[PDB]
Design a protein around this nucleic acid. Structure first.
Lengths: 145, 110
RNA sequence: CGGUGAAAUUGAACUGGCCGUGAAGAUGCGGCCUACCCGUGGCAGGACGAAAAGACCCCGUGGAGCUUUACUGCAGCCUG
RNA sequence: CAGGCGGUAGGGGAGCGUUCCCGAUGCCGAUGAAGGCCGACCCGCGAGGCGGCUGGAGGUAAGGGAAGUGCGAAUGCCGGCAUGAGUAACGAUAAAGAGGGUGAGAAUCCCUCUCGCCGUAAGCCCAAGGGUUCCUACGCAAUGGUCGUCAGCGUAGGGUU
RNA sequence: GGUCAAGAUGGUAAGGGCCCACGGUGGAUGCCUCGGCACCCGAGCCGAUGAAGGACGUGGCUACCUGCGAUAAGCCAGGGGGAGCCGGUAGCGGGCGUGGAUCCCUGGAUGUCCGAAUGGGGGAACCCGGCCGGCGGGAACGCCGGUCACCGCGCUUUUGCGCGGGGGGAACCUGGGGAACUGAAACAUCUCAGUACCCAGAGGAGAGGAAAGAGAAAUCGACUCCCUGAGUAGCGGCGAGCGAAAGGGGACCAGCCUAAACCGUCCGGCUUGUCCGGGCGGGGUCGUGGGGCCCUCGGACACCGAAUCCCCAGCCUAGCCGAAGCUGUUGGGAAGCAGCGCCAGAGAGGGUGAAAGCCCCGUAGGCGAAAGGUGGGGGGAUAGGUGAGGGUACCCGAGUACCCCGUGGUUCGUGGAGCCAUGGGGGAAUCUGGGCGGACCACCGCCUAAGGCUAAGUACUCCGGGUGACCGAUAGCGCACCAGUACCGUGAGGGAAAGGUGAAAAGAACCCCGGGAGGGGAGUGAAAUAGAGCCUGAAACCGUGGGCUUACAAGCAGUCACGGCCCCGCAAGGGGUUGUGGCGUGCCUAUUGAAGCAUGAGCCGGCGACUCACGGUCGUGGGCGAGCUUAAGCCGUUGAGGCGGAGGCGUAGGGAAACCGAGUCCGAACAGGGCGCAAAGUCCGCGGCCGUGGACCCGAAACCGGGCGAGCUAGCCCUGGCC
């Protein structure tokens, strides 16, 4: 019976009509009622087409794969891991499958600060990966179908 | 005050009223409880007709409205009405029992 | 005189002429000349009189009705 | 101390009532809910209290939430009420005047007496289509373009085989 | 005191102007409802035993609203039920009933005439007819009556006996056929869209519904509906735009069959032997066999989609109880202020003359109950019919698959364009069979087509119940109660208004002007400025009285000043009223621009227009940085929230890609651009804000669909008359 919205929250701009005294809202006739006019963009659309193109995604719906999920040895070792075996499987918490564009696809070796690899078998190890993987101390592996 | 009722010809009390002096309930409807306690009317200073004396002004005015009347009165006045325990083969006897009691036995009085 | 008892148009108006003036044809703003209160039966000038958001127009990459060997098809005819 | 403060379009800020939702119904109230009617304390305002009259029962907020909402104004929408107007108008230039009568009142009903216009129709007739009414008896506040004790008007009853 | 010359001021309204009092017509309207509307559950078929839907009837005395229909305010029987009823009329004039009367329900009976109508016709609701019965004056007449389409449907070819349908229905529903606008700011591909609408038809819900499927993992496994799947994959004057599918989360989870010659059986066949035809079957393919020969076989658990029957049949409408106060008291009132005493697994609400747990209410408390009409459950029985192993020459689910063009689907608009689907011509395979993944070819894989049946989970709303930061009589259904009727239109078709007197009728005897209305009194009563259109009852406009004011005056208005009146006043002074004067072009819209002579504007009153859903997007108020949770399952007066972890957004990105990767594509180039740079977002809200949706609001020419009319008018046809 008291806690009114703290700061501002509550209705901030449902400003009614056009002006305390006066009122009318905008320009001149060009924007009447049935006036949801020249929408998004006129000459901007000209641009839109304005150019040949080199990106063609043809008559279809069934592409292959080579799973590009950006994973980071940095989140890993900085503070959420097990320096030898984690595997795609163990990466749930990992913020490299817990987002959206390929959750379950493939975890690559964002080899960065300090070493730059992966000491846990898997798939996605930058070349830089293979190398600092070998330095950091890791057993990486990669079986198929 | 519905398809169901309170007392009938009965004999009862006037709480919120002007009389309280209970007495003969000459008639009581089914829906509008409309009941006449023969306890407060008028004259309708009649037609001027020979319907009433050629020189008229009806007398017995008695349409009893309000329902704050304290129906039923055993050796007890204001009391609700019980129901049954049957007791006998085929026994409704929704007689009135509370504190004192009265059921309007078909005898000595209604 | 008596019985009767409507109808558009219109801010409200108590609304002279002037010479002037003003968006450029004014009772209503300027300076000035006459002229009190009211009403009837008339006379048509103004108040752009009423009347209908001009059928003159323009304008609206508006509509609709012919048309023509404009554009595309439909019909029916002719035809492997 | 600056220092500024005409100012639509338009952009920013900040308040106003307004009917509902909690209203953690507080209740207030027949010594009145409410809307109303009037008023030289409150508000920089949108509003406020408060006083007085009406008026018959509601109404509601301390704090916050929800919105068919605040309107001259759109030849607007619906309902009133005005205006020329007590002038224009009464539906045909086929005219009517009297006497007595009945009546609460009769230019405007009834008889009867003078009189004009139809007559080739303002004739009768069948039919159509109307479908009450026709009659007889009461009545007129509505209706006839005022009348009106008259009616094809209102009330009732009977009426065509 | 009188005469004359001069000057200055005064009152005197027919009406009008501002102010005050008091009326009237007008209904705002505050509140108030047996009335809507919104969501959710319940419910979901009517009809020839001629229905839905109406015409004319009856109520002693009734136009009408009612219910019945000719046995007509109803008769019968059973279920229910407490003592009153002869519906809304209360009035008249008569009644039935505790030897369950009014009435609530379930099954009863005639059940007028119309309406599918059907015995025939016909402008429906009215006129005709043929058969047996009857009565009357017999025959002729004429009534009750039972009687007599049509359809296709199967049965005895002769019953033409015995069935079926048809006729409806607010919305949902399947297929049949199927359109312009508007967008694409033109517009012809395109678009709205397979949308509106005409139709046919099965239902109570149909729809679809056991795979020549998916999809590529050596995977799934009916069909339907929800969330997600991307609005990506993509379709395209690649433009406006349009836009999937497997999977995953969820819900709901039966699967079952027939001709399929072979068997034999059989009857008809033709014509006889050994072909076809049609009945019984075993076979009667579920994810593949089925049949016929040889051998191992085999001697009790399975119910349907109602197989089916009996039940606690859920209800239908009637049921029942059921908690505790009185004294006082201010009041016309009290249920109120006050006193003490009271209930509570039931302080949900309404109702009893102003606001009660203990007063009215058969409610929340809990419980109740029936011999009819409906079944899921739980279980039984009824159980058709399913339910083995190898061997062997094979014959045994469709008449067209398939391929040419002509077309439909589909996220496909013509394309390299696949699969299903059909209009033309071609024109076959039995499990080495044949369509399907990749136009197509070589593979593997997939499924088993060209028959059949149905449940269960999303839709829909006529009808019932309930709840509403959903409405109050101009909003709500237009419609709150003799509104889908008044009334306009030819028909099609359009389509109002009017809610409240009061607490209860005690609503007005009676006297008085009057033809009447209506007007003064008496009584009403708490009021009648509560008096019958009669609550609250304001603005507008017209009225009766009072104050100031007004006849040498030129001005929207006004209004600053002041002076004369009159007013409350203690004075201060405050009111209203103005004559003298100063200065003052009225407001809205669209205008370079308005006094307008440009416009809107008649006056009052109530209505009267920047929203909602998402997408988003930027802000900013709030939770953790990885942050947040749909569809559901579950607990839920209050119904209490909890859980549900298919996801989408982040978390490097760079590229047409191959990919590489914090690096990177160009590239043979150490030169640039996307960065690296986290400088964490992610979610909830509130809000400026676009995109789609009618998105400030009402506004047009018109285009398109389906119907409506020749008593419209011109024509033509038939048929009288008149000149």
């Amino acid at each position: 019976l008291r806690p009114n919205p703290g700061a501002n929250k509550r209705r901030k701009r449902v400003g009614r009509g056009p002006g305390s005294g006066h009122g009318k809202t905008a320009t001149r006739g060009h924007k009447g009622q049935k006036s949801r006019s020249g929408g998004l963009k006129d000459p901007r659309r000209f641009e839109g087409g304005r150019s040949t193109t080199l990106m063609r995604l043809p008559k279809r719906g069934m592409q292959g794969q080579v799973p590009g999920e950006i994973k980071r040895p940095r989140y890993q070792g900085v503070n959420l891991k097990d320096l030898a075996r984690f595997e795609g499987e163990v990466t749930p918490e990992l913020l490299v499958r817990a987002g959206l564009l390929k959750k379950g696809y493939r975890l690559k070796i964002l080899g960065e600060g300090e070493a730059k690899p992966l000491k846990v078998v898997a798939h996605a190890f930058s070349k830089s990966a293979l190398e600092k993987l070998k330095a950091a101390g890791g057993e990486p592996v990669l079986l198929e179908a | 005050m519905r398809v169901k009722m309170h007392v009938k010809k009965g004999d009862t009390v006037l709480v919120a009223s002007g009389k309280y002096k209970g007495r003969v309930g000459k008639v009581k409807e089914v829906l509008p409880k409309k009941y006449a306690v023969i306890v407060e009317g008028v004259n309708i200073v009649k037609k001027a007709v020979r319907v009433s004396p050629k020189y008229p002004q009806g007398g017995f005015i008695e349409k009893e409205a309000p329902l704050h009347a304290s129906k039923v009165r055993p050796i007890c006045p204001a009391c609700g009405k019980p129901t049954r325990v049957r007791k006998k083969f085929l026994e409704n006897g929704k007689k009135i029992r509370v504190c004192a009691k009265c059921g309007g036995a078909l005898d000595t009085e209604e």
